[PDB]
Amino acid sequence: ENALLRYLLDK
Amino acid sequence: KPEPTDEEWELIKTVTEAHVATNAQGSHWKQKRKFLPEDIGQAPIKVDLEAFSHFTKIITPAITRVVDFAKKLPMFCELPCEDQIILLKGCCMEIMSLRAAVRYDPESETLTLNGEMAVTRGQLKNGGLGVVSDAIFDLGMSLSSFNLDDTEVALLQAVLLMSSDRPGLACVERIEKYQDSFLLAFEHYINYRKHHVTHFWPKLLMKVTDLRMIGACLASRFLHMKVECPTELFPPLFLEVF
Ligand SMILES: Cc1nc(C(=O)NCC(=O)O)c(O)c2ccc(Oc3ccccc3)cc12
């Protein structure tokens, strides 16, 4: 889970 | 009283610059601000769902500013990806509430959300926050006489972000080490500032408790917001921080 937050942290 | 060391000044500059660069509208916020009209957010007959919609639209960029603040802190970037998500979910609403509370205007009795939307106590109450709305406005009213500057707000945000008591963390000790760096820098910067308020540091430490409570209550109230409203109505980034 947390795919959106996780992509914002990787960006 | 002891004042910042050279390493602490470096740290002061880093978080202050991270805060200033992620704070919506920055210096302009009082000019770019429009009042939510009184006909939106009045008490019903539960939730006034037109006010709910307006807050639903602005919550995603508010969270995102917080994510961008943490990413500008080298200590936050040291942490594994999993602890980062845990730390962001725990402090998001605490930091947003603080960012709104320092933007209280006693002339209008408003808080400014998103750098743009000025809302009253009743509008934020009826739009879905409930008693937590009273808690934020009370926080903002008592923060006028503290005269916080961007550095002090930046450090409060750091202290909340580096909370090792969030459940599921692996770097408990590492994260608490970081928090004590911000707290000592913060105390030393407060010693250097010479506020005309007695027992300033103790009183500030009490406001951190206030924000932790707001944070824990927003999370409570959002589960009690899955009553009238279906999950579709909440934006996806909001759901991620339950
Ligand atoms: C607590 C806070 N703050 C801010 C904010 O942007 N202001 C602070 C800032 O400058 O970053 C919001 O935009 C919020 C939006 C919604 C919210 O709850 C709700 C969520 C869904 C429905 C109703 C209220 C709390 C906010």
Residue numbers in the entry:
A (entry chain C): 741 to 751
B (entry chain A): 211 to 255, 263 to 459
The publication says:
The thyroid hormone receptors (THRs) are nuclear hormone receptors regulated by endogenous thyroid hormones, including the inactive prohormone thyroxine (T4) and the bioactive hormone 3,3′,5-triiodothyronine (T3), which are critical for development regulation and metabolic homeostasis. As ligand-regulated nuclear receptors, THRs have a structurally conserved LBD that allows the binding of distinct ligands (Burris et al., 2013). Although the defects in any of the processes in thyroid hormone transport and synthesis can all contribute to RTH, in most cases the disorder involves defective thyroid hormone receptors, resulting in reduced T3 binding and disruptive thyroid hormone signaling.
As expected, the native ligand T3 abolished or substantially diminished the transcriptional activity of four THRβ mutants associated with thyroid hormone resistance, V264D, H435L, R438H, and R438W, respectively (Wakasaki et al., 2016, Nomura et al., 1996, Sabet and Pallotta, 2011, Narumi et al., 2010). Surprisingly, the treatment of roxadustat either enhanced or retained the transcriptional activity of these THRβ mutants, all leading to higher induced transcriptional activity than those of T3. Although all four mutant residues are located in the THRβ LBD, H435 is the only one that directly contacts ligands T3 or roxadustat, whereas the rest of the mutant residues are located outside the ligand-binding pocket, not in the range to form intimate contacts with the ligands, which makes us wonder how these mutants influence the ligand binding. The structural analysis further revealed an apparent conformational change of residue H435 on helix 10 of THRβ for all four mutants, resulting in the loss of a critical hydrogen bond between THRβ and a critical hydroxy group of T3, which is also conserved for the other THR ligands identified so far, explaining the severely reduced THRβ activity by T3. Specifically, in addition to the direct mutation of H435 to the hydrophobic leucine of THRβ H435L, the allosteric conformational changes of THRβ H435 were coupled with several intermediate structural changes, predominantly in helix 10, which were initiated by mutants R438H, R438W, or V264D, consequently leading to impaired T3 binding.
